């Protein structure tokens, strides 16, 4: 605008490209929706199967065969908020596991 | 320790198109 650009709030982009692969066949372990914005990755899963606050563990990966980073995660209803954007994510429900990947654009 | 590939088998997109691209 005038001289500079006064940009209100953060630029938001809920990044909707992610894929899942899993060796489990339980539909209640596979995420139904994933999206990040900036850092916080929102993972909608069937967390309603997990009572007593016994929610599953989620890890982040820098690469698909990298180490599983425990990271910071908050659980809002059925959505896991992973604090920090990583190209790959790993979700572990008990001893079952699902892998997510965030796909870059070109 | 995970002495086996965690994920694989079927890489399928799960991109947010839950009903609409967002709404």
């Amino acid at each position: 605008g005038s001289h500079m650009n006064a940009k209100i709030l953060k630029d938001r982009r809920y990044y909707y490209d992610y894929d899942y692969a899993t060796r489990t066949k339980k539909s209640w372990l596979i995420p139904s929706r994933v999206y990040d914005d900036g850092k916080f990755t929102y993972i909608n899963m069937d967390l309603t199967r997990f009572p007593t606050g016994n929610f599953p563990a989620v890890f982040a990966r820098e690469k698909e065969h990298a180490e599983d980073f425990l990271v910071n995660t908050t659980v809002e209803g059925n959505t896991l908020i992973v604090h920090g954007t990583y190209p790959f994510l790993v979700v572990r429900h008990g001893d079952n596991v699902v892998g997510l990947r965030r796909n870059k654009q070109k | 320790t995970k002495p086996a590939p965690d994920f694989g088998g079927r890489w399928k997109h799960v991109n947010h198109f839950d009903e609409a691209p967002t709404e």
Side-chain angles (χ1 to χ4, degrees):
Chain A
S2 179
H3 295 239
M4 58 73 179
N5 295 327
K7 49 187 174 183
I8 306 177
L9 290 172
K10 69 180 297 294
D11 58 286
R12 66 186 185 241
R13 176 169 293 203
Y14 298 95
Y15 204 82
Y16 306 117
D17 201 322
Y18 51 92
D19 302 296
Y20 76 101
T22 182
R23 296 182 57 208
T24 191
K25 57 187 297 298
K26 297 293 185 177
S27 43
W28 48 280
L29 305 185
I30 300 166
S32 306
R33 199 182 299 145
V34 182
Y35 53 75
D36 61 270
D37 172 69
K39 294 176 182 298
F40 303 108
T41 311
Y42 303 92
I43 315 181
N44 294 91
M45 308 193 302
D46 205 26
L47 301 183
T48 182
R49 312 310 171 194
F50 295 94
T52 314
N54 192 87
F55 294 106
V58 62
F59 305 97
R61 279 183 181 172
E62 303 189 288
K63 188 178 61 179
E64 48 181 86
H65 285 230
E67 61 181 78
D68 302 64
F69 295 81
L70 159 64
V71 292
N72 287 329
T73 309
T74 309
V75 56
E76 288 298 287
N78 62 28
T79 321
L80 292 180
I81 303 167
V82 180
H83 298 206
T85 32
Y86 294 79
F88 298 97
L89 295 308
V90 176
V91 191
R92 181 180 179 158
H93 286 234
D95 293 294
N96 288 269
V97 66
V98 180
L100 281 165
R101 70 179 178 204
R102 183 188 192 244
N103 299 274
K104 53 60 169 287
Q105 298 296 270
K106 52 180 178 293
Chain B
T1 306
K2 47 279 297 299
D6 302 86
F7 50 84
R10 175 56 63 193
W11 273 113
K12 190 183 70 64
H13 54 242
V14 45
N15 72 88
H16 183 189
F17 198 102
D18 190 74
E19 198 64 85
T22 308
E23 183 174 79

